[PDB]
Ligand SMILES: CC(C)=CCC/C(C)=C\CC/C(C)=C/CSP(=O)(O)OP(=O)(O)O
Ligand SMILES: CC(C)=CCC/C(C)=C\CC/C(C)=C/CSP(=O)(O)OP(=O)(O)O
Ligand SMILES: [Mg+2]
């Protein structure tokens with residue numbers, strides 16, 4: 001297909017995966033929006049290989065090999081995702097380094113893993129979420145990367161921690177735990193408590209501890225919003241605030257995370273306030 | 276109850292939990308056999324708190340506090356397990372140190388844990404299995420503890436590794452993995468493979484690697500059998516060989532450990548050959 005239809009393929013991927021990010025980034029000007037769709041599709045394919053694929057090691061290694069060929073300018077393909085990404089790399093000064101770092105992060109999920117400390121948690125969040133922010137920065141803030149970089153990394157932390165806090169039960173059903181072990185020890189929330197899906201006062205203490213770290217990172221990220229060009233402020237601030245709202249949604253549902261969505265109407269409220 | 280009925284309570288515990296250990300240790304002379312029942316009951320209560328209890332941290336801490344009171348000679352109780360254990364400690368020179376170390380091992384199972392290396396695996400096996408052997412040694416080999424000690428520790432390794440190899444699926448269903456992560460990486464057996472309960476050629480390579488380590492430890496332990504007094508050789512050698520036979524049982528069932536017992540008749544064959 002031609003470039004328009006290659007980008008349209010990527011628009012469908014983001015629209016199907018995330019109402020929050022699709023709605024936020026649709027507000028960008030044309031070529032920035034299309035580049036974000038292509039970059040998002042690269043992240044989505046990597047994460048889907050590891051989180052949903054049948055042999056994730058072999059399939060992720062093949063994905064990494066293809067991206068190597070892509071960066072050498074030598075990938076010949078009809079895959080719409082690569083056609084779109086080729087244009088984005090040629091149209092904006094995208095840096096391959098965070099793309100490689102994302103693949104490093106996805107490798108972290110291939111084998112059994114225990115998060116021991118908050119520092120362990122942030123190392124994981126950096127490689128699977130902060131890198132996405134770094135991938136997007138040349139599109140969202142041309143010429144201003146170094147002054148918004150730290151906020152973008154911390155927005156990554158905030159969003160990934162939020163994801164983890166929403167998904168404790170879903171991840172447990174998949175034999176994954178991202179809650180730091182030292183935090184379960186600090187608050188007396190045992191593996192047996194988690195296994196029984198117990199929402200007790202120790203659970204809430206631990207959950208709120210992590211949630212407050214996420215809230216701190218969101219606040220730090222939002223403080224950098226005036227340094228973005230005007231056309232990125234509502235997309236980035238809107239993405240940040242709709243994802244942050246997952247936290248209060250879980251609180252309002254009494255921390256029941258063993259069975260949470262910001263409502264369509266609430267997303268529209270947040271976007272309207274940004275605008 | 277009196278001492279006879281307190282020990283009988285412990286005989287029932289071992290008979291219900293393990294046909295292998297009950298059959299092996301019933302072959303000991305009277306007072307050694309009764310002491311082994313009491314020591315086994317102490318191990319069984321600790322492991323059951325952590326593996327089957329409802330709040331294992333609080334319940335294991337209370338168990339540890341009671342054992343502290345017991346060792347000070349100040350526990351007043353009607354619990355048959357403590358009455359039996361009191362007699363065993365007064366009748367034989369039992370060393371409290373491995374009893375404390377067992378509780379350290381049980382604490383290891385309270386919170387999320389990843390075994391990374393074989394050394395990590397052996398550290399766990401030492402604290403939950405080798406300590407049992409060390410607890411029993413003054414009863415099984417009076418005056419010969421230091422010359423049979425290393426074999427007893429390695430028999431602990433062999434038995435716990437065997438237990439782990441038999442129980443991979445049962446432990447996975449309980450959100451526990453004892454297979455070393457570095458071994459899954461070495462052989463290319465991913466967390467997704469394990470989650471799908473796949474018995475492929477990479478699984479068999481990993482399983483056989485661990486099984487051969489266990490076989491090495493069994494051989495080392497059995498080489499020390501001539502240093503035991505005659506009345507302990509069939510109990511210890513018989514316990515060792517019936518538990519080792521779990522390995523070949525799993526092999527004969529094509530490594531299907533996601534749904535294995537040595538048969539009653541096979542246990543009788545092993546005991547008869549020892550005798
Ligand atoms: C606009 C800007 C500067 C940054 C926005 C993009 C960033 C930094 C992160 C996206 C983070 C997440 C959690 C995507 C969901 S993938 P998932 O739901 O499958 O998550 P999982 O694989 O369970 O971790
Ligand atoms: C006679 C002599 C010198 C030593 C014999 C006793 C020793 C060293 C170990 C007993 C080991 C095991 C695996 C008991 C099963 S408890 P379980 O089936 O619940 O195991 P788990 O809690 O899953 O690890
Ligand atoms: Mg995912």
Ligand SMILES: [Mg+2]
Nearest residue numbers: 047051109128
């Ligand atoms: Mg993921």
Ligand SMILES: [Mg+2]
Nearest residue numbers: 163164167171
């Ligand atoms: Mg998630």
Ligand SMILES: [Mg+2]
Nearest residue numbers: 322323326327
């Ligand atoms: Mg057990």
Ligand SMILES: [Mg+2]
Nearest residue numbers: 322326384403
């Ligand atoms: Mg146990």
Ligand SMILES: [Mg+2]
Nearest residue numbers: 438439442446
């Ligand atoms: Mg077991």
